[PDB]
Design a protein around this ligand. Sequence first.
Ligand SMILES: *P(=O)(O)OCC(C)(C)[C@@H](O)C(=O)NCCC(=O)NCCSC(=O)CCCCCCCCCCC
Ligand SMILES: *P(=O)(O)OCC(C)(C)[C@@H](O)C(=O)NCCC(=O)NCCSC(=O)CCCCCCCCCCC
Ligand SMILES: [Ca+2]
Ligand SMILES: [Ca+2]
Lengths: 85, 85, 74, 74
Amino acid sequence: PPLTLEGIQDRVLYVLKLYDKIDPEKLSVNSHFMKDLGLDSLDQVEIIMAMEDEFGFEIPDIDAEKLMCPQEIVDYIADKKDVYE
Amino acid sequence: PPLTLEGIQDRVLYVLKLYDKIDPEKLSVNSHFMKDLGLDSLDQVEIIMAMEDEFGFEIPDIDAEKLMCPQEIVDYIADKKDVYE
Amino acid sequence: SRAQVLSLYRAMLRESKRFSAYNYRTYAVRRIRDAFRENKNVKDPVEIQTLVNKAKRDLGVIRRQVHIGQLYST
Amino acid sequence: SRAQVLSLYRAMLRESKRFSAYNYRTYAVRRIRDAFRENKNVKDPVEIQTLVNKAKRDLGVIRRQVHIGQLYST
Ligand SMILES: *P(=O)(O)OCC(C)(C)[C@@H](O)C(=O)NCCC(=O)NCCSC(=O)CCCCCCCCCCC
Ligand SMILES: *P(=O)(O)OCC(C)(C)[C@@H](O)C(=O)NCCC(=O)NCCSC(=O)CCCCCCCCCCC
Ligand SMILES: [Ca+2]
Ligand SMILES: [Ca+2]
């Protein structure tokens, strides 16, 4: 089934709900991985690699290092897969 | 120098002004390669390959086959190189 | 079919770019363009399939020549 | 520097994924994660360079092991 913004956001958050270092009750679509969820940049590398696995494509280093909340990930996936609704 | 929408459009049109089959006086940013410029789909394959050379990256077949006027090419390049102004 | 012809056209032109000598890149491109265009207005469907099979075959020839050229390189 | 450490961290985890056996993928990932984390709060700059050089070297070890595994594959 073709990707939608709703499906992208649901799957991004699903991946994060399986990352065991995140407190489930602080996770929101605008939770900053560092300032809000208490993660570090080693965790962030792993999280973006998990997004690559979920959506089936690689994210260049320069792009991956900028994605620090779920909404930024959603926006990026939607862009790179050309999803508009 | 970082890419801009103005630079993208100027270079797209430049590539087309060097394609010798196009009548210079019909070429505009919204000229349809087939309906307006009298080209065919063999020409169109070559034109998009020339855009790949100009901008330094490959365009998948499914994407390339849809680009049938300069503005569509400009919009695509800007998207794929993440250019917003 | 139209899609198959245009896919092979693009693939052959892509492989042509991989020749190291300018003269041979231009030779391959010219041959490809003339060969596809001179059959543009063929109508006989079986004749189309025959020409498609030739493109499939010559795409293999081009790829093998590219590889051999890489072996003779420096 | 921070950027170099994180680039090597990602590169090593990427290579780890290329092992064919599940158990060895998980072994490599666990070793990488523990090795980088257990040095997170090192401050001595020369000690940092030493650890960076180890990562550079072990990235080579990982790549060679991946290649040898591919040769023993079916
Ligand atoms: P992020 O929170 O913004 O930044 C995280 C880092 C670690 C970059 C940051 O906290 C930092 O700069 N810390 C300072 C100290 C430092 O850089 N520590 C890391 C040094 S690099 C290192 O320890 C690599 C060790 C290599 C071991 C590899 C083992 C591989 C095993 C292979 C099995 C097959
Ligand atoms: P577009 O205008 O929408 O469509 C263009 C085409 C040609 C697809 C369309 O007009 C069409 O369907 N035409 C019908 C006939 C047809 O399909 N003709 C083309 C047949 S394929 C062909 O002729 C390939 C010939 C292969 C020769 C290769 C030579 C390579 C030399 C190598 C040198 C090293
Ligand atoms: Ca896009
Ligand atoms: Ca984009």
